[PDB]
RNA sequence: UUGGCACCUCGAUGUCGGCUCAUCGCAUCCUGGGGCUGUAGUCGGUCCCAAGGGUUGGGCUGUUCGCCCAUUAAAGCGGUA
RNA sequence: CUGGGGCGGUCGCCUCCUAAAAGGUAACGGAGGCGCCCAAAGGUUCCCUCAGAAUGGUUGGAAAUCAUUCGCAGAGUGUAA
RNA sequence: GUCUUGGAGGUAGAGCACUGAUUGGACUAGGGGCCCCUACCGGGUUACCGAAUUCAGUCAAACUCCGAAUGCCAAUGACUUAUCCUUGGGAGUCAGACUGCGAGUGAUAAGAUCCGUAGUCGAAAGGGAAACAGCCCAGACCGCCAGCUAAGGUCCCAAAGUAUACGUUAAGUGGAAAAGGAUGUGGAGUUGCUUAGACAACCAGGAUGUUGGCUUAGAAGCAGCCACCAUUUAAAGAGUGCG
């Protein structure tokens, strides 16, 4: 559950979205995190979704990262009402989530912690997903 | 197997001070039936005479292809080590004279070890 | 029971795919799973 | 269903609801047959197959719906301008 | 004008975005403003450079002023991009 | 028009150079907590928020230090091509649709509306797509019982191969839908164990202390908080799971 504290405008355009993120498509911060497959919105009570549900499942466990954060204001016109007439009322927030931007980070988890705790998480993300970890060089 | 190699290199040495040896049976290990063969023997001294049951004729009975070949013929059948450092036999070769032959497993038609050359009546 | 995400839950169930349906069966009679 | 859009019809496509006459889809109310049961028998919940048949007489309101009277194996939904 | 009309709202002028790397380029799309003001806030000559920060001080204060470095501009440029 | 060459412009992408938004760590001006005292100066405790600043890392139509692909404006060298400029006479249309690409509104809904760009229809017949104004191919001066091809096909309907080679699928997939689910299945690859004897399957046995220190009437294996371990050992979790 979050949101940008003070936007520049409240009234946004939807964009498009298509290609590989800008960036952090590489888990560097904590050790496990979910890497996304498809385009998509994710809305605010998505993260709130998850952010519970792995420390249901992480009792004792490390901090866990999100590096996505929501800014877009997705939009609605009150209902049963005709088209045109001013752009709607921001419904609320909705993040931006290109495909191959690693999702969260968990750490201070073993393998076997991370394959549930990092899976039920993904049963609330609208995207289908696969598990990714890091990897030196370096 | 690395392993494989160090249990071969040291039971070498109670096989050189060796004179006598007697089969033991493997099916029906009770805990209490080990202390009825271990712990007499820990009556006499410590753990010199065996009972090890890593005992294959392929991992174990390599090793004794030196010493008193008598004991190839139950390879087919169920064999754990025991052999000797000290005390000669005069009492320990009658250790399973008396639980063996109706409790602590089965007697077992067992056809023997070096006792001089022979196969039967371990006395 | 029958549900589209069949799965075993304690490690007595197997997983038989008969007549091209992944049923689980095992000995406790509430594990009886199919999807169809 | 309330809707969005205005693409058949404004040199006419009769709009609510009843009465008749139905068919059909089953996402099933029964009845037939089963898994599970937090199923002792009795009576159930729940998930399966199954459309062949049955699926009421009122009071009120124009009412569909709704509540209530008493029965019933039950008093199913829904399409067909 | 209109997502039928009515009611609401807008009708003209300047700036941005939507605008697809010339330039235009729509909608009841997304933001602001404009019906003025300056006898100098005009012309020219000749000077000089900001905002903020730190350091220390007079009532001195989170900040009016005053000094030394920082400070390519985070300041101003009448009024808004 | 096409190639060379010269350009203007800040888009798509990117990245943080600013305007913003933001994840996490160090740093801690200030604050709060808690006490001492504050009758006042003040001090100490922070796993309490926290401005700067800094190490990384995210994201912007109204953010650009940077900046493509085409597109437009021209030159002078050509190599094709028939168009263009003025002038006058003469009218029609100033409601367009669909498809792709880029956009907004919309719910990244609509055979939805409203722009750019390109096509076709409209004003276009023929063959495909079963029939189909907008898709695919292609332009009907007229006759031929001429030939060659494009899209699509080549068992019967219905013209043309039961074509040829190598495989894949077993559902009628083809011949209509996802999150998810599975010892379905073909390839590619990695590793563990493994005749120094693996994986199943069978004859085996399960630890002595001990529930072990603290407990709920006791529960001594799973009341539950835990050092949860030393001996007999081929072994045995101070217990695999059912009770």
Same mark, same amino acid.
């Given at each position: 559950?979050? &949101? =940008?504290?003070?936007?520049? $405008? !409240?009234?946004?355009?939807?964009?498009?979205?298509?290609?590989?993120?800008?960036?952090?498509?590489?888990?560097?911060?904590?050790?496990?995190?979910?890497?996304? &497959?498809?385009?998509?919105?994710?809305?605010?009570?998505?993260?709130?979704?998850? !952010?519970?549900?792995?420390?249901? $499942?992480?009792?004792?466990?490390?901090?866990?990262?999100?590096?996505?954060?929501?800014?877009? =204001? $997705?939009?609605?016109?009150? &209902?049963?009402?005709?088209?045109?007439?001013?752009?709607?009322? =921001?419904?609320?927030?909705?993040?931006?989530?290109?495909?191959?931007?690693?999702?969260?980070?968990?750490?201070?988890?073993?393998?076997?912690?991370?394959?549930?705790? &990092?899976?039920?998480?993904?049963?609330?993300? =609208?995207?289908?997903?696969?598990?990714?970890? !890091?990897?030196?060089?370096? | *197997?690395?392993?494989?190699?160090?249990?071969?290199?040291?039971?070498?040495?109670?096989?050189?001070?060796?004179? @006598?040896?007697?089969?033991?049976? /493997?099916?029906?290990? %009770?805990?209490?039936?080990?202390?009825?063969? %271990?712990?007499? +023997?820990?009556?006499?001294?410590?753990?010199?005479?065996?009972?090890?049951?890593?005992?294959?004729?392929?991992?174990?009975?390599? +090793?004794?292809?030196?010493?008193?070949?008598? /004991?190839?013929?139950?390879?087919?059948?169920?064999?754990?080590?025991?052999?000797? /450092?000290?005390?000669?036999?005069?009492?320990?070769?009658? /250790?399973?004279?008396?639980?063996?032959?109706? %409790?602590?497993?089965? *007697?077992?038609?067992?056809?023997?070890?070096?006792?001089?050359?022979?196969?039967? @009546? *371990? %006395? | 029971?029958?549900?589209?995400?069949?799965?075993?839950?304690?490690?007595?169930?197997?997983?038989?795919?008969?007549?091209?349906?992944?049923?689980?069966?095992?000995?406790?009679?509430?594990?009886?799973?199919?999807?169809?």
């Amino acid at each position: 559950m979050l &949101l =940008p504290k003070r936007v520049k $405008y !409240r009234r946004e355009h939807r964009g498009k979205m298509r290609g590989r993120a800008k960036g952090g498509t590489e888990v560097h911060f904590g050790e496990f995190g979910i890497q996304a &497959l498809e385009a998509s919105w994710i809305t605010n009570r998505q993260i709130e979704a998850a !952010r519970i549900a792995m420390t249901r $499942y992480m009792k004792r466990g490390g901090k866990v990262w999100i590096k996505i954060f929501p800014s877009k =204001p $997705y939009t609605a016109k009150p &209902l049963e009402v005709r088209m045109g007439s001013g752009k709607g009322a =921001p419904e609320g927030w909705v993040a931006v989530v290109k495909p191959g931007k690693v999702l969260f980070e968990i750490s201070g988890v073993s393998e076997e912690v991370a394959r549930e705790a &990092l899976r039920l998480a993904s049963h609330k993300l =609208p995207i289908k997903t696969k598990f990714v970890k !890091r990897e030196e060089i370096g | *197997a690395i392993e494989t190699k160090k249990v071969v290199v040291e039971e070498i040495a109670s096989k050189l001070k060796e004179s @006598k040896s007697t089969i033991i049976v /493997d099916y029906r290990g %009770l805990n209490v039936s080990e202390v009825t063969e %271990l712990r007499k +023997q820990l009556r006499e001294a410590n753990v010199e005479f065996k009972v090890y049951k890593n005992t294959m004729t392929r991992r174990a009975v390599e +090793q004794a292809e030196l010493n008193g070949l008598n /004991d190839f013929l139950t390879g087919p059948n169920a064999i754990a080590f025991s052999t000797e /450092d000290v005390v000669a036999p005069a009492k320990v070769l009658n /250790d399973f004279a008396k639980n063996h032959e109706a %409790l602590e497993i089965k *007697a077992g038609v067992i056809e023997g070890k070096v006792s001089t050359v022979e196969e039967v @009546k *371990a %006395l | 029971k029958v549900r589209p995400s069949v799965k075993p839950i304690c490690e007595k169930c197997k997983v038989i795919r008969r007549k091209g349906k992944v049923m689980v069966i095992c000995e406790n009679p509430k594990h009886k799973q199919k999807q169809g």
